[PDB]
Amino acid sequence: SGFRKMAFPSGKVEGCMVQVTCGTTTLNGLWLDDVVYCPRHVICTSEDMLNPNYEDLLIRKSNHNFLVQAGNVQLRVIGHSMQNCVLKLKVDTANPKTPKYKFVRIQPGQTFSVLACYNGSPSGVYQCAMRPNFTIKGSFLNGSCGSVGFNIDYDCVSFCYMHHMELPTGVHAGTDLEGNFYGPFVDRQTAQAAGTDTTITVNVLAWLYAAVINGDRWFLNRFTTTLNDFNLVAMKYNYEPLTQDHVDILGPLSAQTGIAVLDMCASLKELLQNGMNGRTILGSALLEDEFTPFDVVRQCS
Amino acid sequence: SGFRKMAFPSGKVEGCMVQVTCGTTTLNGLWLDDVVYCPRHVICTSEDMLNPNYEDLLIRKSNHNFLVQAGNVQLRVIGHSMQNCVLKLKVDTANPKTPKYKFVRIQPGQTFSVLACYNGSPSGVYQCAMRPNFTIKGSFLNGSCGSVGFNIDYDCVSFCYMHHMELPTGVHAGTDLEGNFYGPFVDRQTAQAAGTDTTITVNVLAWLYAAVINGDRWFLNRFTTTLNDFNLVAMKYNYEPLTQDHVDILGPLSAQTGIAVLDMCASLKELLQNGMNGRTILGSALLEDEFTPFDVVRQCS
Numbered sequence: 001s002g003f004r005k006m007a008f009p010s011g012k013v014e015g016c017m018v019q020v021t022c023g024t025t026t027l028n029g030l031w032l033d034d035v036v037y038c039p040r041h042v043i044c045t046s047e048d049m050l051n052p053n054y055e056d057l058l059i060r061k062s063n064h065n066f067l068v069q070a071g072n073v074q075l076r077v078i079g080h081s082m083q084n085c086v087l088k089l090k091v092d093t094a095n096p097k098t099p100k101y102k103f104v105r106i107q108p109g110q111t112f113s114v115l116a117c118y119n120g121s122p123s124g125v126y127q128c129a130m131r132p133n134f135t136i137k138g139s140f141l142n143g144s145c146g147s148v149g150f151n152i153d154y155d156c157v158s159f160c161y162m163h164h165m166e167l168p169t170g171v172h173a174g175t176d177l178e179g180n181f182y183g184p185f186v187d188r189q190t191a192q193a194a195g196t197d198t199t200i201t202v203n204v205l206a207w208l209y210a211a212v213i214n215g216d217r218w219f220l221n222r223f224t225t226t227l228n229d230f231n232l233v234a235m236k237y238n239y240e241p242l243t244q245d246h247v248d249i250l251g252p253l254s255a256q257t258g259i260a261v262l263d264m265c266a267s268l269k270e271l272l273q274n275g276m277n278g279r280t281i282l283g284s285a286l287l288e289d290e291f292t293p294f295d296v297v298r299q300c301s
Numbered sequence: 302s303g304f305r306k307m308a309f310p311s312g313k314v315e316g317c318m319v320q321v322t323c324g325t326t327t328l329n330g331l332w333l334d335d336v337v338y339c340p341r342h343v344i345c346t347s348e349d350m351l352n353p354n355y356e357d358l359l360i361r362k363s364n365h366n367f368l369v370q371a372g373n374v375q376l377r378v379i380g381h382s383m384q385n386c387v388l389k390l391k392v393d394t395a396n397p398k399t400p401k402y403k404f405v406r407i408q409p410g411q412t413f414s415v416l417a418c419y420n421g422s423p424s425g426v427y428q429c430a431m432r433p434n435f436t437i438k439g440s441f442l443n444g445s446c447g448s449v450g451f452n453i454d455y456d457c458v459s460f461c462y463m464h465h466m467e468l469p470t471g472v473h474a475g476t477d478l479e480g481n482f483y484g485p486f487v488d489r490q491t492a493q494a495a496g497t498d499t500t501i502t503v504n505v506l507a508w509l510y511a512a513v514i515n516g517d518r519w520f521l522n523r524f525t526t527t528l529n530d531f532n533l534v535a536m537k538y539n540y541e542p543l544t545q546d547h548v549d550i551l552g553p554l555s556a557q558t559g560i561a562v563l564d565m566c567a568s569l570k571e572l573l574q575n576g577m578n579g580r581t582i583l584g585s586a587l588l589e590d591e592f593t594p595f596d597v598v599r600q601c602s
């Protein structure tokens with residue numbers, strides 16, 4: 001039946017994307033009810049970016065300093081404030097395409113869909129995990145800033161990410177929709193590096209369950225193991241520790257397949273020590289860690 | 302930077318998806334203007350699966366046998382005709398969400414986005430390529446039939462795929478939106494199997510050019526090759542023959558990076574001989590063949 005990195009359908013979010021301009025800087029905003037959300041760094045000249053005083057730069061600004069474009073319509077900005085690293089532009093018009101939504105903050109290891117934008121114009125959608133080091137491995141060029149991450153639960157869009165910057169290594173850093181950074185990052189032109197990342201162990205196991213469900217069974221074995229024995233291997237390979245809670249979340253997949261988590265940890269232990277003996281799993285030569293147990297259950301059942 | 306299997310924003314396709322029911326069979330239809338397109342096999346029962354006489358099964362149907370449903374709204378069917386393997390249900394309402402669109406037949410190697418859908422509700426979006434053996438490696442469960450593949454260039458949706466069936470090896474077969482199958486396949490449950498699959502050589506080369514644009518150079522070598530020597534090597538690894546057409550298509554990525562097409566071909570021959578020696582290219586430990594030369598520029602420069 002097959003297994004693919006799958007994004008949520010993006011239409012409910014496409015209806016919310018606008019172009020925000022302040023001086024020379026144009027980038028993407030999120031228009032929900034009568035507010036446009038975008039990165040506060042939209043107000044900064046290149047010179048400001050080196051050591052910005054947002055407080056001071058913003059009082060110096062007025063409503064008319066902000067051009068908001070929803071397709072071929074100018075919105076009138078009637079107010080401006082800041083919450084953490086996010087700029088809120090109050091507009092005269094409630095977005096008639098506002099979906100059922102909430103602002104949510106996600107945990108490392110959780111996945112979400114990204115609508116990549118360019119002049120308030122949506123261009124692509126991809127799935128990605130919040131890394132243990134609080135970065136994401138996006139695909140962004142200039143103009144992507146204010147591109148947004150989301151999940152959909154029934155009809156409700158849960159917004160969890162707004163893109164702020166690229167780090168030197170090609171990875172991306174951003175905020176929740178309340179403007180709190182994911183990770184130890186600041187919105188200033190300064191020296192910042194991604195911390196050393198780790199592998200999301202519970203997601204690798206979920207993806208091994210997806211492989212078995214799809215008839216990729218070769219890596220299975222008669223053996224089992226313990227959390228403690230496994231976690232001494234994981235810690236060795238820069239794998240996150242597996243907790244009792246991770247084992248409980250993989251419950252449904254363990255039932256559906258007949259392979260218990262420490263059963264499957266034994267398989268993963270051997271893959272870490274011995275490698276893949278030149279094979280693939282679901283058409284990958286890497287151990288994939290950007291599918292959650294929920295993602296595997298949603299896609300396979 | 303970053304390099305991601307990115308799907309087109311799905312919103313313009315989401316507003317076209319409906320549920321078609323006939324007898325005890327429910328699947329997806331595509332509602333454009335006053336027509337719903339779906340697989341003709343919606344009109345089959347149990348003993349119509351091996352040798353359906355579609356002309357005989359359809360003449361016995363009236364408009365009211367077809368229950369079409371857009372969210373909660375029932376659409377009234379006022380007409381029906383068959384075009385190749387696609388059924389066309391005429392309805393009394395034109396879809397107010399109809400985007401600018403066209404129907405295109407794609408060739409092997411081309412990529413598109415798939416909007417996977419169940420009971421006319423979109424569930425996810427992913428990027429595919431038409432394999433050289435005219436199948437797609439999708440993610441499709443029971444009820445996905447009538448899910449569509451598409452590109453979006455400058456606000457115009459080009460429909461290129463409609464999902465009909467899963468073959469014994471877990472890969473997928475379907476039609477263009479004129480009802481003609483890709484490959485030698487038929488909408489009958491008689492034994493059928495895909496041709497042996499090959500790697501899309503032109504796409505792999507485009508992806509090596511993207512790796513060089515994004516700063517990877519470790520796999521380059523001082524060698525060149527003749528086109529003919531390259532094909533004699535590449536076919537021993539089940540790679541598609543590279544043609545002069547393919548060489549012309551890579552010209553711009555050649556010019557951008559200053560590496561001739563037959564120099565990059567020498568690099569590919571070396572990678573097939575050596576593998577990757579614990580390294581990765583753009584985040585993969587395999588040579589990726591689902592990015593086209595056109596996609597590589599859409600996502601790079």
Ligand SMILES: OCc1cnc(N2CCOCC2)s1
Pocket residue numbers: 001441442443444445446465466467
């Ligand atoms: O219940 C019997 C079936 C199971 N899976 C099916 N699908 C898989 C691929 O998409 C079309 C057919 S029919």
Ligand SMILES: [Cl-]
Pocket residue numbers: 052053054055
């Ligand atoms: Cl400050």
Ligand SMILES: [Cl-]
Pocket residue numbers: 406407408411
């Ligand atoms: Cl094509």
